[PDB]
């Protein structure tokens, strides 16, 4: 009974690449033992067992890393004795993953030897792995924006196609320097953070912080 | 027989029966529809050498047959015809149709 | 019917549904030797009545009783399998109980 | 029907450590819920679910980690009811598995503070942790050959009942100077490749360098 399908918030800890949860009633039948539910990428089904039987409790059934486009499900209620209930179908337009996964190995290239947090080269180079959802949605990009040693925002600039980025010497000690303090300096102490962002899909789970 | 069909089901049927020859007074014979008068009935079972007895057309007097048929084709007037949902599996064609004789056999 | 019998349950491997079910009270019986003669399925590897043909005049619900049965040969999972229904030229079928569910819902 | 043992491959990508995998045809019974196959070794059986039901499609059940020897296998079809079908009897002798693992935290002793790609002693001394597999299979050892920076081949030396190797300094700067350039030299700049082989047992998947 009520065979539907609710998507995933947008913001949440946790629930990392995680589409929609499919959620139904148990069937009146008292007698079934589990449930086949047939996704239609999928080559098997999930089963998900009726352990306990409440009749006015939901059962659900998550997915996690199936990319947007048409899905079409057909839940199934299977007896002791065998017997498959008549099949449930829904169709419905699966979105895409709105709790990103967090960039990974956000370091420094171009670091001081001995002591880490110190720069050796004149340019900052920032260097990020891949985040693993990248060949599920294609439109994904990252937002890069780098702070200040007094807590106060710097640069927001969007990379693409690429996953790493420099921090040029003339940015630093024109651009930043005269449109914020009106004058010429180079900001030696700098924060760099960097998320996952999408078209459609929403931002990643938490800042990937230096 | 796939994933959900493991075994073959007793399978039953609802036929609608033998067409039977129903004889008119005039003289033509019309045989297209199964009947539920039973004397027609009846009478197909007794004139069938395939199954039953082989009594021809011959040892049977015609008239006397189809007087007594319209004795059990009297419409009944006690109940309506609305009173019957399951028109069509009671053995009625139309439910326009009176199709309330008497005595009625499937 | 050895053949359709594996693709069955363990029970009904060798059962069909009795023709008649009512066959009429008369003097002849009592109420609980009448109510309690009236079968519903029989067995078929002793039965030899119970192969026979049956004549239905009218709609009424009956068996069928198997004549061939066999697969495919690169699918062996699809059967085909023959069942004889009725006698004589019926003007045809109303319904088919797949089951014990009718392919058209009450 | 047709229950065989297919042994893996010679050198794929993934499949570390396993053996052939079992092959079967689905039982003509069309009410079977799963096989119950009995390995020798194992005290449980594999039971492995048949949850979609085509006649002409293979099932498999691989073996992973299983030694070579003496290996008897039984097949059973499961129904709803319990009962069981005649079980299928096959013994065959099994092969070692001819996917091995790559050669873990390959690293050079004697390394530079600060920088770690630079020396420190004058002869190079190289580490690395034992490959997992050992245990499987008895008769393992390594090859190590060690490169030039002109991309020219230098040493092929074989390691055995030992998890470590040095380059002595008179090795290069004799042996191998006078070999190949016909002189008296020391190539300072070095590549290391390791990877693991056996006598009947084949290569690691990948080569393990620095």
Known sequence: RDFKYTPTPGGVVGAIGKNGELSWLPSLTNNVVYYSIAHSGHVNPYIVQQLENNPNERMIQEIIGEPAGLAIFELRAVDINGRRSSPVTLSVDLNSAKNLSVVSNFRVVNTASGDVTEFVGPDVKLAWDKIPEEEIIPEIYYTLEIYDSQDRMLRSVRIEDVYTYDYLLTYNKADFALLNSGALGINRKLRFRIRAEGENGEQSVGWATI | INENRTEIPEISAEVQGKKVKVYNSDGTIKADKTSLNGIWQLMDYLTSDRYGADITLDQFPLQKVISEAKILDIIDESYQTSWQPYWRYVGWNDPLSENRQIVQLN | ?106
Chains 1, 4 share one sequence.
């Open chain 3, 1 to 106: 019917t050895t053949i359709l019998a594996k693709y069955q349950v363990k029970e009904e491997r060798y059962k069909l549904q009795s023709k008649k079910k009512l066959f009429g009270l008369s003097r002849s019986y009592s109420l609980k030797k009448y109510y309690e003669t009236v079968t519903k399925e029989v067995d078929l590897d002793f039965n030899l009545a119970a192969k026979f043909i049956p004549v239905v005049y009218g709609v009424q619900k009956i068996p069928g009783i198997p004549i061939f049965a066999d697969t495919e040969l690169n699918n062996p999972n699809i059967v085909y399998v023959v069942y004889a229904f009725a006698e004589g030229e019926i003007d045809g079928f109303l319904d088919f109980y797949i089951g014990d569910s009718p392919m058209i819902c009450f």
